[PDB]
Design a protein around this nucleic acid. Sequence first.
RNA 1: AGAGUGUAGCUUAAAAGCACCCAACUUACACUUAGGAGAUUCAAUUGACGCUCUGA
Lengths: 119, 116, 217, 45, 99, 141
Amino acid sequence: VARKERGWRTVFPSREFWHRLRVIRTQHHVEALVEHQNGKVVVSASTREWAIKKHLYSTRNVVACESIGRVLAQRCLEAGINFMVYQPTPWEAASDSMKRLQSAMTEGGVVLREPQRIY
Amino acid sequence: YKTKPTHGIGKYKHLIKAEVRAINLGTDYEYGVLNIHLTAYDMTLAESYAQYVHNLCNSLSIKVEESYAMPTKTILTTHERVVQISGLSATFAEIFLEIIQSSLPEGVRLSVKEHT
Amino acid sequence: SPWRLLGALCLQRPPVVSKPLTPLQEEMASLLQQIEIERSLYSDHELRALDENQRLAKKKADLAQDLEDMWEQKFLQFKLGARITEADEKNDRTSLNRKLDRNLVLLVREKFGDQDVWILPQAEWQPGETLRGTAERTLATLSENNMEAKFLGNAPCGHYTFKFLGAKVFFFKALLLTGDFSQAGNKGHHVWVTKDELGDYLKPKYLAQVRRFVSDL
Amino acid sequence: DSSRASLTRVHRQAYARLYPVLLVKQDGSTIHIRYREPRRMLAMP
Amino acid sequence: IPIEDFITPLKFLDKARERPQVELTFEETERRALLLKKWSLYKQQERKMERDTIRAMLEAQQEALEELQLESPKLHAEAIKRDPNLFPFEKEGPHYTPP
Amino acid sequence: RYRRRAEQEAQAPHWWRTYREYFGRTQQLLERKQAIQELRANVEEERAARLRTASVPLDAVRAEWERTCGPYHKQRLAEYYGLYRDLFHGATFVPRVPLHVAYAVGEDDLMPVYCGNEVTPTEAAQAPEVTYEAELWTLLL
RNA sequence: AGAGUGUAGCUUAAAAGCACCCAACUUACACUUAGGAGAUUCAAUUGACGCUCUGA
């Protein structure tokens, strides 16, 4: 029922969500955020984190994205968040580690599309 | 708005130059446009060495105008590539040329000839 | 102050022979060879050697080896020039062919009245003499030859200033195009140094730091 | 450093086989040149 | 005149049938990964060495023009000056066999 | 890159009117380098890494997460669900103890109570199983 | 001999972010995708191993 911020049509990305998944790929670390509209980070999963950094070989590859999607999806089911709006750029969309990331999420248990607001 | 302190916060055309001789004035001395021909009987040495010269110039922040190639000559074929360069400092002429001198792979000759 | 006006010249030899490959460069070299083979597109020499023995096999069922053996025996005729004319000498430091793959530096013994120093060749200049003309004068002064060298710019490369009375020593840079180095048996002591003898011959910090503008590669 | 941009590969797609043929121009200067039908030693008169 | 030789040969179309067998094993691809990784290390350390030559020699020539600038005021005005002789500049590469 | 600098300038405190105004050790690094060097040393694990088929076990990541940086993510979630503005009038704290509470669902399994879950009152009919690793304590709901 | 001292290239980062390299699309460059390498100089805020400068 709550208001999705409907506007912002000229400016990428959309604000019309309640939860945005945002993958931050740096030079050294694959990072994954789950945020509100307000910029409050709700649930994150980063490879700058000793519980997951030591099980991994390299902190940036398709393995780290598949694992950060497994771990992030498992963290978001237990946080009671089933619905995100992930919006990529069209080069980030066709990348194999973000298809592997989205498959890790939707096979994890998290639907990457929110239901509509009821008016 | 004009009468507000936030006037001109959105202007951007002063951030873009949306639009040749040699400049040796009194202290700030620099060459004009340059040309570097590369002639070899291998496509790989001319193209790849042109890549290496071009990445050296991008790593030295040089205004590289064009990086095209010339047609060949049936003699076998003599392969040529042209790399244009504008902007060199006084030390930067010697330090820049000495690495192209000390980086020729196998039997490829140079040119520091100029335009037209 | 009385400045003892000194310029010099750090002569460079362009290497005529390319360096041999690293074994890592050998393995990556053959790897690039194989990936070039696996992505090529039907050379006619294969079409004249594979399909021709197919059709000649059909003729016997009812030559490129000559060509390759001619090419290989012509490859066995002409011997190669040595990349090392260096180890047979091992002592011809005065020879311009002392090393071929590296860059070689003119470097001559001198004996002052108060000093006795192995020296990168210097020049006593005049304010009427240009520093570029000081180096071009340094080309044909001590060697007494008909070398053909090349300069890039009026910029220097290494400055070392020792005093006793002031002085300053300027180290410029040239490049040998060719050279008619007549009478290689001079009375001087020119020794061509790649990199490593430059600390074996020049000890003080105004001379054991010439390598910081020598192209080490 | 004369082996940096020599460890190469033909980066096109319409290219046939190329062989490491040694060539001599006029003065006894053998250079590997990618050339067809493995001649091995070349010489221009 | 805009004429170049980047056009593909028209002969390179019909007989593209010599090599349909492109298959490798596990261990050759593993060693190939070691070659690409260690060769990326190799070229990386190469350009780190060349960056050390550019920075080292360039600081040597900048301090050269500063010592010449402070020890000769009328000779660093001409030290910046450029030669009329590098205009038809050439240099052939190295070879294998000297004459 | 413009997106990165652009988000950084978005979060910066500006002097004009903006959307936010209205809509607002050494032994550990030694064992870490030794264990990461001993981890990256295997050629089998490097082969599983380079073939994008390597896996990660989730349980050790979960418990080790509960030890290392669990309480700070749980502080994020309690800030997000408003437990600090409502349960202590804004005064924050850090949940240091990795608690466990789960409701006995029948006899076989038990619905876990993590930070932010959905549990029915059918599953919450009976008082739960409380297990935590500590040594006094008062529990509240 | 003394002074300034000291994170991988840089950081009023606190083991991070940019820089960096290879492979592919590119004539090439760039973008992007895939991969790679990296340091708190050693001992208890302090002393001595290394760099720079001021001298002989």
